[PDB]
Amino acid sequence: SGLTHKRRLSALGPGGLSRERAGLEVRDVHPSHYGRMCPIETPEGPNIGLIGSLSVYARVNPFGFIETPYRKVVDGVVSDEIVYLTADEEDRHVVAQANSPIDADGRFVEPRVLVRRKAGEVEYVPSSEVDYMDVSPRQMVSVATAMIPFLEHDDANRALMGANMQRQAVPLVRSEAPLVGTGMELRAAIDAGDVVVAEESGVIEEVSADYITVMHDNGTRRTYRMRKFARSNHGTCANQCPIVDAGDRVEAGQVIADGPCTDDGEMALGKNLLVAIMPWEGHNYEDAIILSNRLVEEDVLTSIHIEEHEIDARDTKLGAEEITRDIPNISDEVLADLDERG
Amino acid sequence: KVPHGESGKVIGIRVFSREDEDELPAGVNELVRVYVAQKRKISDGDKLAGRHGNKGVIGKILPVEDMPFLADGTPVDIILNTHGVPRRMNIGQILETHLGWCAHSGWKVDAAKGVPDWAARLPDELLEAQPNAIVSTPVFDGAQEAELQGLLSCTLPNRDGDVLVDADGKAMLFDGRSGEPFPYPVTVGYMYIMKLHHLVDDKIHARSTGPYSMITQQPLGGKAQFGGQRFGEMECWAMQAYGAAYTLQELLTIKSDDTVGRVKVYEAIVKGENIPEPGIPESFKVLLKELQSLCLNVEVLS
């Protein structure tokens, strides 16, 4: 949720359009978004099209225009010279697809390959006029949409919902990484910042639920503290637990402690469950679900929530606001838990 | 005071003070903060979801014994309906399901005399995997249908020489409730489901009587105070269409803002008498005063 929040582009705000005033010509997906803003991920409600997410490989140049990397082909030879282009440069040239038959020497197997022309038109061009190629598939999709396996077999309407619902999952007490993923989990977990990464290589000295002590190769020792049962902005848990032993040797950049929704450094938002695809007595009727009682007995889907309450003492003109056990009109049975000072 | 509909252990108390020269907003002498923690399990009505937009609340939670179980006695953990898959065009989940099983049991492609054709382009180190293996299919470059079919055709037995899921990906289940086997094979696998933050414990609310607003004497709103469910303008047309006049009158007079009707109806109910007749809502008198405050001489004749 946080990682996706930081990579968000909102068209509405001070100096921008309004949610109840924008037409359907600004909510559409322009053919110049390829590689610069994900076409799937977007709100489902009345904000649809006004809020989007930056793509994985995109960057912003000094003038504020988003760029994408393209691998330039010279005389039909697919080089490794990555050049960052903006919308206009991409418009001038002809760009091929990443998933094309490269023949181990940077040469397409067949001459006819799908390309994108000036106005975003798609055509078949002989493999001699191509100027550039995408650095990879998975270039047009964002971080959230890059974690849906078998995305090309899902319709856009359902992929949008699946991407928007991965950032509502609650962290569970015990986490489990998926059996079938997409390899984006590790990078997203590490760049989200919810794990502890060994800043410098060394050997572990002490490990406990509260801290980790690392003895660097040159004298210095560093102690990492852990966030235990800390509340987040939305009232969930923010546990951290070490995943290293007292003798293991760590290396710079290595994950040294898990986070809320990570399993050994990889994002783990849910659990792997054994599922059948049958209709059963009408209890799973019209989008409902049936669960086993095991998932309750074994605390498979149990979670921890934390609530915060505040109160303060203020002077006031009359003066002297006090926090004390002496409360008028209150009996003693209702003052049993309160300690000596409130 | 801990507000309505909350509980749990007190895990943390953070108390500030002006005595210890702590930095507080001007005019504040002390600041106390209390944390209350709850451990919630999954229950009927909690919202679940997969990675392919297949959401849905939990309809039922069956005991372990009366659930469809495989030939070796393993109950299934979740049951999903067939009619939602083909219509919404998210067949991807099924593929995941299939691959999940191949990741769970593990497989071994038999390259005894040449690798099979379908595994010609399958990267080596995938020709055999141990049980509970973890694999990855990048978003737009992954496992083909031919490769999934091949992997399903070759998969390891569980403990004895039994293969529970056939080449089609479907297994024979037993009806855990009546005991008879189901007539046809069913599609079983492993799917990665998440728990969304739309729990019932925050949604349920009820009220008989409670706080009332100040300017207009209608009940408050929201679970934190108590509040009543709005009976809007669109719900009044349905009652008029039904022809139910008395229900609408009681809803709009002695349940919302008839200041004396409320107490009289409560007394009549507790004493077993007949419910009295409604009076005049207070918001109408508020409206008359607001109109008079605009220099409009609104008067009610007879």
Binding site: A188, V250 | S136, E147
Partner: peptide, 26 residues
Amino acid sequence: NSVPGAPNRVSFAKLREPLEVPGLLD
């Protein structure tokens, strides 16, 4: 693949990626 300590998660990918994903918070 580049992180020092990471789980071994085998991939079905066929193509090779010339460019590694940048810093997601850059």
